[PDB]
Amino acid sequence: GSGVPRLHRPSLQHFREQFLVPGRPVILKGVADHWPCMQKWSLEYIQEIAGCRTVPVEVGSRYTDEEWSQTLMTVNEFISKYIVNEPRDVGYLAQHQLFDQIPELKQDISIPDYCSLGDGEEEEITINAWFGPQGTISPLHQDPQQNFLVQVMGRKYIRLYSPQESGALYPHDTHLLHNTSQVDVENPDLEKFPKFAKAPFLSCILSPGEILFIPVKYWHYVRALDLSFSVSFWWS
Ligand SMILES: C/N=C(/NC)NCCC[C@H](N)C(=O)O
Ligand SMILES: O=C(O)CCC(=O)C(=O)O
Ligand SMILES: [Zn+2]
């Protein structure tokens, strides 16, 4: 496929018309790049503000066979165990609303203006922290709302497949896992999943300051390339 387009602070109507309404992915630059989080958030500072709080942590590379488990620990324990000291397994602080838990971290972000183009209420926008070492993998999956994924620390390799291509992505049959792909994007078994080979996609390397707009129900797979902190806004 091709690289995801990058636009420097598009006007709202131009984002509405070329991207939101047709549902095409884009990176928005010059938008979140000066938010306080971009210069303020570090291991020192995350420990200082959030260190003693309780967070859920996903342990294991990815979630299919339950090797993957979910646990709870303090942010300090997560940093020390899964990031700093030669971790024994991949832990990921994933899909957690950490800014409703620590309001003082919410002062470091904002809700992007483009969300007001939606039909939903600003109070109901779901804000999720994603924080973990180099190498976390979110398997190919789709989400029920629009998403702004704001990169803060580190880089993420991302791949996007359209809803129109779902027939080549082999979703799990169980309605629980309905929206997750059985395919390992970066090493697909093409004996089992042959149609995955021909399906087109976009990909990118998302970097700090940059916002990736993921259209509703667009499939995405995400691998952190460095120690990484992203913040997702689910809106509608
Ligand atoms: C690696 N782990 C992850 N989540 C637990 N990755 C991305 C979130 C996928 C989830 N189905 C969603 O609703 O976005
Ligand atoms: O693991 C990641 O960073 C991707 C998060 C994600 O899937 C989402 O923003 O909905
Ligand atoms: Zn997602």
Residue numbers in the entry: 181 to 416
Study authors write:
Our recent discovery revealed that JMJD5 and JMJD7 specifically make first cleavage at methylarginine sites on histone tails through endopeptidase activities and continue to trim histone tails with aminopeptidase activities to generate “tailless nucleosomes”, which should be overcome by Pol II without further additional assistance, just as that of Archaea bacteria. During our pursuit in the characterization of potential histone arginine demethylases, we found that the catalytic cores of both JMJD5 and JMJD7 specifically cleave arginine methylated histone tails through both endopeptidase and exopeptidase activities. To address these questions, we have determined a series of structures of c-JMJD5, JMJD7, and c-JMJD5 with substrates, coupled with biochemical data.
Zn2+ substitutes functionally for Fe2+ (see below) and is more stable than Fe2+ in solution. We found that the methyl groups of di-methyl arginine are buried in a negatively charged pocket consisting of one glutamic acid (Glu238), two tyrosines (Tyr243, Tyr272), two tryptophans (Trp248, Trp310), one Ser318, and a portion of α-KG. This configuration is similar to the structure of Tudor domains bound by methylarginine residues. The carboxyl group is coordinated with Zn2+; this structure could mimic the final step of peptidase cleavage with the oxygen of the carbonyl interacting with Zn2+. Interestingly, as pointed out by one of our reviewers, the sidechain of Ser318 makes a hydrogen bond with NE atom of sidechain of methylarginine, the binding should also contribute to the high binding affinity. Based on the complex structure, much higher binding affinity between c-JMJD5 and pH3R2me2a (~0.1 μM) versus Tudor domains and methylarginine containing peptides (~4 μM) can be explained by the presence of additional charge-charge interactions within the methylarginine binding pocket of c-JMJD5 contributed by α-KG and a sidechain of glutamic acid (Glu238). From the complex structure of c-JMJD5 and the methylated arginine derivative, it is clear that α-KG is not only involved in pocket formation, but also forms a salt bridge or hydrogen bond with the methylated guanidine group. α-KG also participates in the chelation of Zn2+ ions. First, the sidechain of methylated arginine docks at the negatively charged pocket with aromatic cage, bringing the carbonyl group of this residue within close proximity to Zn2+.
